[PDB]
Design a protein around this ligand. Structure first.
Ligand SMILES: [Mg+2]
Ligand SMILES: [Mg+2]
Ligand SMILES: [Mg+2]
Lengths: 275, 276
């Protein structure tokens, strides 16, 4: 069908990028996800997968004066779905059909206020040009509902595993490496198209250039448990990128580190013009 | 203007003080930071952290930010800029205002504020909306003194400052009051100043400025008492030469946009090339 051919083309984009980049590619997010100028710039640097999302758009629009990612996360559900549809379509307009776009929308994460996505909304997301939805729901039953509607409208789902003690949940809870593997396998059976692990916790005593052994072991459990493409999201920067890649995970979700470099470039050029 | 004479006057006085404070803070010449630094709140904050005190969100830049009709150059964006709803510029202005606070100066380019290719003018209510969205000023590229008169009337009523521009009759696209000779630049500037235009700019698009441009800028600089601007073609190779004319404000967009884009390209390239 039409949904079917669409999803097959979309997965090929992801598989091609993984291959092109030697087994690990990047899901470029933050400002590269929502601003059409910077999305194009990211693609010019080799990015093949982009992720516009609602907290980043809150930051871009100065929603409620938020100036940190953390503050933006707390108001992300206030960004209307229509705004994400406009952003997604705008980015698609400029990067063309070969780039992969997965969108974070209000109601697509575990929100702090219960926004329910309706079937209608998945149709709208597909009509806006997204290839997928970036999902941080925190129960398997919620993921089943998301997968059903996403697949109906020709969208792929990338969804995540987190830790039960996370202050703000960003996925299916897994306390131990064994539970990470079990959660990944269940998510694969449900039909989640790409499965990731939240890896952003900062540990005391992490050796320079390395990832903390707790995270590495959790990632290993994900990487070796499923056949679908795997992701790591959170805490990835240029000092530990290779350490993340060494785990064999297929996609590194990178936003903050890129935001920081782009922001600093702007600060420095203004500083130069003024001096 | 019934009941809001003092309200508007105070607002305009505080806004101009932001500009004059920036000019002195920066040694006699400051910048009006535009392009992505004008419309994206993350990058506006980054610009302010680098020392920027004046920002300019504008509709062609927002068209590019939104990928409107797939435009990927500012040239193409200028051609569809009138399709960006005023409401979107109001949202952008308020959003940047939210993050930079009350001390930063913001002047906004809006549909109908430039010389649009379709009949499109700002109504009185539009200036009210612009003031309500947190703008200090409107960034105006109108082609007749008559048009500026109506803009100044409504802008000032609602406590907004006007920065408006002088162009050349030979310009491919109209961005201001036509002035052929440096003497006419000075004449135009004086007339605009009399009309009430608050800041007056000249379109200026090796490390030297073209002699013709330099003569026009010098004419502008010595013709009026209000803050003066130069807009167009300002980059790292010639910005000192622009400063040396004594013009108060350099409007810089493209050069900053390019550096910011290149930074994004390079950081992505860097990640993809990291080796053990
Ligand atoms: Mg995410
Ligand atoms: Mg594999
Ligand atoms: Mg301008």
């Amino acid at each position: 069908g039409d949904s079917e051919q669409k999803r097959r083309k979309a997965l090929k984009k992801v598989l091609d990028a993984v291959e092109e980049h030697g087994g690990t590619t990047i899901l470029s997010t933050g400002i590269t996800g929502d601003d059409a100028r910077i999305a194009r710039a990211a693609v010019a640097g080799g990015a093949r997968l982009l992720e516009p999302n609602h907290p980043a758009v809150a930051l871009a629009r100065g929603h409620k004066g938020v100036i940190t990612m953390h503050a933006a996360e707390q108001v992300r559900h206030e960004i209307p779905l229509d705004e994400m549809l406009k952003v997604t379509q705008g980015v698609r307009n400029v990067v063309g059909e070969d780039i992969y776009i997965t969108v974070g929308v209000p109601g697509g994460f575990t929100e702090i206020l219960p926004l329910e996505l309706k079937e209608e909304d998945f149709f709208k997301i597909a009509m806006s040009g997204a290839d997928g939805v970036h999902i941080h729901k925190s129960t398997l039953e919620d993921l089943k509902d998301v997968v059903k509607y996403a697949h109906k409208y020709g969208l792929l789902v990338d969804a995540y595993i987190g830790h039960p003690d996370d202050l703000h949940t960003f996925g299916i809870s897994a306390r131990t490496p064994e539970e990470v593997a079990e959660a990944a396998k269940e998510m694969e059976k449900i039909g989640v198209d790409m499965i990731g692990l939240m890896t952003g916790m900062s540990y005391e005593g992490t050796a320079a250039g390395e990832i903390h052994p707790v995270i590495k072991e959790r990632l290993s459990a994900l990487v070796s448990s499923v056949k679908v493409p795997t992701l790591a999201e959170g805490g990835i920067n240029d000092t530990n990128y290779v350490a993340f890649k060494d785990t064999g995970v297929n996609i590194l979700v990178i936003g903050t580190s890129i935001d920081n470099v782009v922001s600093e470039a702007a600060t420095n050029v203004v500083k130069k013009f003024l001096s």
